[PDB]
């Protein structure tokens, strides 16, 4: 038996996120004690994104541009870096390089998807933009997401150089320099990484799409919070516990 | 101390030609960077700007004819040559220091025309 | 980018008088720079990047602003002789340097 109709039912929320407040702002955090966002309870509304942005560079990771409205996302956490065009490839999974070693390290196993666009018409300083702070030497390397914020003078020697500069000694931080006709290459890039889980979770940020009335002891086309089928809708006597 | 001086401003005449020049001391042309801005009489400022470590160039110009950085690096002085300066410009120049930033000297010289 | 300016002519009864000083700029700018000049003579001193003060000027100074457009206060004493005051940005080149005029008397 075929079916006739489609029932579509998602939460009666809407709300501006808004994005402009992720995205838009200024004056937003050099490369390490970056800042963790977190966003809940809007409406999705993707299709002012299509619109307005001006990108270079979208790339996704388990999900595709097209099927993304949709989608309800369990949570939405915001990343925000100024990068140096060669460490925006070095932000791809799996690669080495100063900053897989050194600063935000990225897993394999990733479900989320990194955009990137390019400043220097703001970023960059007539004399260099030098509060822009990265760090050279660790003695070992990190594991995925978490920060340092430390200061443990480098010792180049056998011998100690007793918490001072000196000798084999050396202050593990240094500052970049962007500036006009810079190196397109070397030149300041803005990175924003989105991170989330898509399945058997309830879910608080949907897309724009409206809902309709559900008809019962009918063969139908259904989407419960993005999980489609065919078939038969009844009463259950199961009670569920608040988190499933 | 930290110092900008001026030395040779340019004085009278009726041939439009004036000269200037400008000496630094307790810092090396080598070291920092120095910009040079110039006033009309009852007018603001006009600028002519330059980052370097030395020997570089920059320059943007209504006009360019005869004109590009004139300098004796070695610490004594730099130099400012033109044809018709006196009239078209030059009431007062002005010899100024940038840094990183927060350590910007400025200095003053009256050219008489 | 150039950049434009408004200013007042106005005669004052009393300090405490708010004081505001605006500029207005063709496209985006990102950094701004913002000086203070008193008449007769053109010493230069400056006030940087986040409007923290250089040394040598009184600790009342706040500055913000918004795009294509710039804004500081200013409340009491000195300030309603000494003020005269001019900005540039240094994103970009050329460095524009920018023109007016403000008295007070």
């Known amino acids: 038996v075929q079916p006739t109709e489609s029932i579509v039912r998602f939460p009666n929320i809407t709300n501006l996120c808004p994005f402009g407040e992720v995205f838009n702002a200024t004056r937003f955090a050099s490369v390490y004690a970056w800042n963790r966002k977190r966003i809940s309870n809007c409406v999705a509304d993707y299709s002012v994104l299509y619109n307005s942005a001006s990108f270079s560079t979208f790339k996704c990771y388990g999900v595709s541009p097209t099927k993304l409205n949709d989608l309800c996302f369990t949570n939405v956490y915001a990343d925000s870096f100024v990068i140096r065009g060669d460490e925006v490839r070095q932000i791809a999974p799996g690669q080495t390089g100063k900053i897989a070693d050194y600063n935000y390290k990225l897993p394999d196993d990733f479900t989320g998807c990194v955009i990137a666009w390019n400043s220097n018409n703001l970023d960059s300083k007539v004399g260099g933009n030098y509060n822009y702070l990265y760090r050279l030497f660790r003695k070992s390397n990190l594991k995925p997401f978490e920060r340092d914020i430390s200061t443990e003078i480098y010792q180049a020697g056998s011998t100690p150089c007793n918490g001072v500069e000196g000798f084999n000694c050396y202050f593990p931080l240094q500052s970049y320099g962007f500036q006009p006709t810079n190196g397109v290459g070397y030149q300041p890039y803005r990175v924003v990484v989105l991170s989330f889980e898509l399945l058997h979770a309830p879910a608080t940020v949907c897309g724009p799409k409206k809902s309709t009335n559900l008809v019962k002891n009918k063969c139908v086309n259904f989407n419960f919070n993005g999980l489609t089928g065919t078939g038969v809708l009844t009463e259950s006597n199961k009670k569920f516990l608040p988190f499933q | 101390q930290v110092q900008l001086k001026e030395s040779g401003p340019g004085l009278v005449a009726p041939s439009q030609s004036l000269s200037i020049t400008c000496t630094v001391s307790?810092?090396?042309?080598?070291?920092?960077?120095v910009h040079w801005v110039r006033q009309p009489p009852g007018k603001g400022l006009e600028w002519l700007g330059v980052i370097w470590a030395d020997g570089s160039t920059y320059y943007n110009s209504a006009l360019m004819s005869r004109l590009s950085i004139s300098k004796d690096n070695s610490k004594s002085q730099v130099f400012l040559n033109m044809n018709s300066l006196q009239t078209d410009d030059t009431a007062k120049y002005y010899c100024?220091?940038?840094?990183?930033?927060?350590?910007?000297?400025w200095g003053q010289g009256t050219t008489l025309t | 980018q150039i950049v434009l300016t408004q200013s007042p002519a106005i005669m004052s009864a009393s300090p405490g008088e708010k004081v505001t000083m605006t500029c207005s700029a063709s496209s985006t700018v990102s950094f701004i720079y913002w000086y203070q000049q008193k008449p007769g003579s053109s010493p230069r001193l400056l006030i940087y990047?986040?409007?923290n003060p250089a040394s040598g000027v009184p600790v009342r100074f706040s500055g913000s602003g918004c795009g294509t457009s710039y804004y500081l206060t200013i409340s009491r004493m000195e300030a309603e002789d000494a003020a005269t005051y001019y900005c540039?940005?240094?994103?970009?080149?050329?460095?524009?340097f920018g023109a007016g005029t403000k008295l007070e008397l």
């Open positions: 307790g810092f090396s042309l080598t070291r920092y960077g």
């Open positions: 100024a220091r940038d840094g990183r930033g927060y350590d910007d000297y």
């Open positions: 540039q940005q240094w994103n970009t080149y050329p460095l524009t």
């Open positions: 990047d986040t409007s």
